[PDB]
Design an enzyme around this catalytic site. Structure first.
Site: not given
Ligand SMILES: [Cu+2]
Length: 99
Positions: A37, A84, A87, A92
């Site tokens: 992340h 993120c 992601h 996200m």
């Molecule tokens: Cu992430």
């Protein structure tokens, strides 16, 4: 205040996804599960006057272990979207209201 990166069940979420803080309060993003992340702010979804570069990690900087942190403190009131990088396309994304 703490924001987790990844939910305990492996979901690709900021926890919480939405919240409010007073101007200048520290926000500590804390790596939790479901790695990797990181945390960036979207140049197109922050208050006018905000420079995302100084509140964003490099895309190249990835958090791969539980308990790592990235801290920011947002001076300017209004709505910010954070995301993120790996992601982003899985949803996200989160929103913080600075008041
Ligand atoms: Cu992430």
């Amino acid at each position: 205040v703490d924001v987790l990166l990844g939910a305990d069940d492996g979901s690709l979420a900021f926890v919480p996804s939405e919240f409010s803080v007073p101007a200048g309060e520290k926000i500590v993003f804390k790596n939790n599960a479901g790695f990797p992340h990181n945390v960036l702010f979207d140049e197109d979804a922050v208050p006018s006057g905000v420079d995302v570069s100084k509140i964003s990690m490099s895309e190249e900087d990835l958090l791969n272990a539980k308990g790592e942190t990235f801290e920011v403190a947002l001076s300017d009131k209004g709505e910010y979207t954070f995301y993120c990088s790996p992601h982003q396309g899985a949803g996200m994304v989160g929103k913080v209201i600075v008041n």
